[PDB]
Symmetry: D2
Subunit: 260 residues, 4 copies
């Protein structure tokens, strides 16, 4: 009987044990919560399926946010199992890798632009919509994962900075739209962490050595710290907070410039 | 021989004499600038043609930013007449009217989302791409028109707030990509102004009366003030300014709350 | 002893049961923490003495933040009782009441400015300094209470918005200075709450009805919501968070404007 | 007959020809404006006299902003000569040198804190107060100089970041207070420039070499660019802009991190 004793949460975005969604579910489950999970397609089905079993869960549903139907169906199927929900966790983001390696103006084609904002920004809205009925039942909350690359230019993040900026806008518009139903909508601007989202980025290690050099805490954050922060926002202790972007980056965002 | 004696500028987004692009072109031409124009489709050709000649210009090219080819071709044809360019003004934006009338989570369908970010956000980048060669010739600048609904939730702006947030992020990513070539990329966060962008918005009228009550200057801004500010950002006096979001809103953005 | 099992915390700024520090101390003690308290002068001593005892504490020390000596003594005396500290909560703020009633520029005198910035902004730094030794012992954290009037113009806040702006800056400079010692420095930007800080503000009730009308959650925050958030920032779950300004305002900060 | 034909502006803060105030006066005077000048004390009197003489001005008044009388007197004396004013330029800032060399928590004593916010933050309000009557005559404007060190932690800026945060807050509270009378209150967040404000800072060259390495334009800004930007804000072209913090930093503020 911890903090989330009796609470339910759906965790979309578990791709590996390094995924941020993993540390969240772990932190949430640690406090007594019951978890549900989605996977983008069959290839991930079996992996997410027993990630669920780690958390005492057998609720694993296919949800490709690119498909409108999959979203509603994934929530249709979930309505079949659960009465309501105390929160939905959206840890999804993607852009064609070519748009993230090279010059912004060059690699940012129309299609690469379309994909980035659809999967990474609109999905949180489409999910929030399909998830709205179940969230109201328990005055649940909504949580997404953003990155300060929306507010500040990082090399090679490119259209993902545009997407995250759009996402952050959606959080405010969702929190404002869903605030009347007791549904808090918040986001976490988490520091850089080497997950499966770092594959293909040749500069990452230098970037990590760099973030380590600038962060006020002189270190990079972990999915546990992120998970605990997510755990808080999804908790009754975070009842008075909506539309907030919380920076779990070791204060990195607050530094103008560091010793050479 | 005024301030822009001998400078050239392409004005995309002139649809009538109310268009913000119109008040900008007015300010530029007033200071000796040379003007070129595009139109979204044939229906506007004769109207833009008519405005172009009004400013001593006969350079009018079809440019539907939804079409990749139309963008580059409009710039291909423009290269035939002009050597280089000192600045590109991006006053274009659009989202399906249904996505701008009603509840955010509800009315924001996937397609309305795609269109909003495509026409209003990606186009400035695609244009920025197609315009680079002419900009490099004269170390021109880039200017777009944003709205503070990206930073704060306004009713009925909905997916346009996500788009403008993406746009404003792109400005930073563009200014950073094109900064090594002397090309300044900036944006103006202009106060609300009753142009053809207000068609279909039933609440616009009350919205305008509100800004009037809150803006520190107790008034709404004009396309002249926006045009005069745009004229400046496109001017050598703004040489030490890139990636800047300039708020020409009579200070409304800086007010937390006003007398009841 | 749940989250704050075995932790010690000094709470300066307990003036009544409505004080934000009160709801904070409540949340901390609720989670098993041992509490210490300061009082500004003799008149409050017996109340703070009594306030400490409500939380199983008899460690009550005089701390007038205007006096450098009074500051250090309270921590000298505290050093006598406690080895180290897991966090210091700075819930202090003050400006001459005249500076908060009328137009900002008329009422903003030099001394009212001096007092406001002295007591409300420098105090967190002087305290952070005198408290540094005890924080290093346990790598404690620092927490202060800010107000969004620093980022946005509210009527009658006047020099307190300038002071809060300085304070919020100090948090970043403190978090960066004390971050190498494991001391996270954060702040909570709490929504408006009718505490003893509302005495003399004739407009409070209308303002409270206003935030109630604007906050996405359609309500005003409580010292419990504020206290729980402080509990988090003072908790190991907030280990990856420093220099952060956390908004416990029911998302009010995220609303550009709502139907009036 | 340029842009400021017939406009008057007072330039407080001219200490040398490198001072930002100098490049502004030059830019304003270049466009036909008439100039007045103050000096902090006797030692600078003859020097300010000489610069005023450069700009066709012999209006030089003693103004130590630390003395309330000097402020009002300087404006009393100025009111005698000029009818009204189209703008007041506040280019003053100071903090005890000891508070700007070392660790923030250490060197920030109570007095060093008092002085910094007094001279650098309160002066703009006291001057804005003493300047209000002359500004109303011509619907003048107010301009101050801020630094992004208020929003982000720079090494050794320390308490000056708190002051700049207060200063920047005052701009909004001033712009909001004076906006109803047509007086626009704005500020320029100018990049680092080696003026007489850099004396005693051993780290400057590395800091400057860094900004040069990070600034999107790969260069540092000049007082001419700042002066031209100030000229704009003090101009009718900036009529729709109040309470705005304009970043003349070569876009440096918009960069999260650069190639190592
Ligand atoms: N890794 C970082 O440094 C970082 C920092 C800040 C924010 N974020 C964001 O946090 C979120 C989680 O990233 P991560 O670190 O866990 O990497 P990850 O690859 O381990 O997890 C991201 C998940 O998005 C899923 N996904 C992608 N496309 C999908 C689709 N069409 N339908 C359904 N699911 C889809 C992926 O399957 C994956 O599980 C992302 O949005 C990311 O942008 C990441
Ligand atoms: N009108 C306001 O209140 C206001 C305030 C602040 C910012 N803005 C934004 O600044 C810009 C100024 O717009 P405006 O005031 O001149 O209104 P406007 O309607 O007159 O101009 C918008 C132009 O975008 C063009 N356009 C739309 N879709 C296109 C496409 N697929 N291809 C090519 N062109 C296309 C339209 O033809 C139009 O000329 C807009 O982006 C607007 O969102 C508007
Ligand atoms: N109530 C709100 O709406 C609100 C919202 C956001 C932030 N805050 C801030 O929270 C903090 C606590 O205020 P509150 O709302 O709990 O009201 P409060 O009156 O109960 O507490 C204010 C505290 O300021 C302390 N103080 C003042 N001068 C002092 C001195 N010279 N020496 C030592 N201590 C001194 C006092 O100990 C007092 O307890 C304030 O800084 C306030 O600005 C308040
Ligand atoms: N140097 C930069 O990079 C930079 C950038 C942005 C803003 N600023 C700030 O804007 C202003 C521009 O500074 P600068 O570059 O011209 O350096 P500067 O040293 O040449 O000018 C500072 C002036 O403030 C005057 N002054 C100091 N104390 C005073 C007092 N008690 N009363 C009256 N006057 C007093 C000084 O005499 C001096 O003329 C400063 O406040 C500065 O902090 C500086
Ligand atoms: C930091 C940082 C991140 C992590 N992060 C904040 C994200 O949101 C990550 C988005 C992201 C989306 N799509 C991707 C990839 C990543 C690469 C995985 C690959 N498998 C792929 O095809 N597509 O990504 C970066 C990219 C460039 C520069 C910096 C960063
Ligand atoms: C403010 C404000 C604006 C002006 N503004 C800042 C914009 O950027 C306006 C974008 C906008 C894009 N697409 C539109 C329309 C407008 C309506 C024209 C119609 N013809 C249409 O089909 N599509 O529009 C609003 C809409 C709803 C709520 C508030 C606002
Ligand atoms: C909101 C809001 C607050 C609460 N809050 C966020 C604060 O930070 C409160 C500061 C504050 C500082 N000093 C004060 C007082 C208040 C009045 C108590 C009295 N005892 C006094 O002498 N001095 O106060 C306001 C004042 C004017 C307008 C709005 C507000
Ligand atoms: C950058 C940067 C600046 C320039 N800048 C933006 C400012 O506003 C500088 C204000 C400033 C105020 N007071 C000062 C001094 C400067 C040193 C002159 C000396 N004579 C003194 O006693 N007092 O100053 C810095 C100080 C430390 C670290 C970095 C910087």
């Amino acid at each position: 009987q911890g903090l989330l004793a009796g609470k339910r949460f759906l965790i979309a975005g578990v791709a590996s044990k390094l995924s941020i969604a993993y540390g969240i579910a772990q932190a949430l489950h640690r406090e007594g919560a019951e978890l549900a999970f989605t996977y983008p397609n069959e290839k991930l089905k079996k992996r997410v399926d027993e990630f669920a079993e780690q958390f005492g869960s057998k609720l694993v549903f296919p949800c490709d946010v690119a498909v409108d139907a999959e979203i509603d169906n994934a929530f249709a199927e979930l309505a079949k199992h659960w009465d309501g929900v105390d929160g939905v966790v959206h840890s999804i983001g993607f852009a064609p890798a070519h748009t993230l390696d090279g010059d912004f103006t060059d690699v940012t084609d129309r299609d690469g632009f379309k994909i980035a904002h659809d999967i990474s920004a609109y999905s949180f809205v489409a999910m929030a919509r399909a998830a709205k009925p179940l969230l109201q039942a328990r005055q649940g909350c909504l949580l997404t994962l953003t990155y300060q690359g929306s507010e500040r230019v990082m090399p090679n993040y490119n259209v993902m900075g545009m997407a995250k900026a759009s996402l952050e806008a959606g959080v405010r518009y969702l929190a404002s739209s869903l605030g009347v139903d007791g549904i808090r909508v918040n986001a976490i601007s988490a520091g850089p962490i080497r997950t499966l989202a770092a594959s293909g980025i040749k500069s990452f290690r230098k970037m990590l050595d760099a973030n380590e050099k600038v962060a006020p805490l002189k270190r990079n954050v972990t999915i546990e710290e992120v998970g605990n922060a997510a755990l808080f926002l999804c908790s009754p202790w975070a009842s008075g907070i909506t539309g907030e972007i919380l920076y779990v980056d070791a204060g990195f965002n607050t530094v103008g410039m560091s010793q050479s």
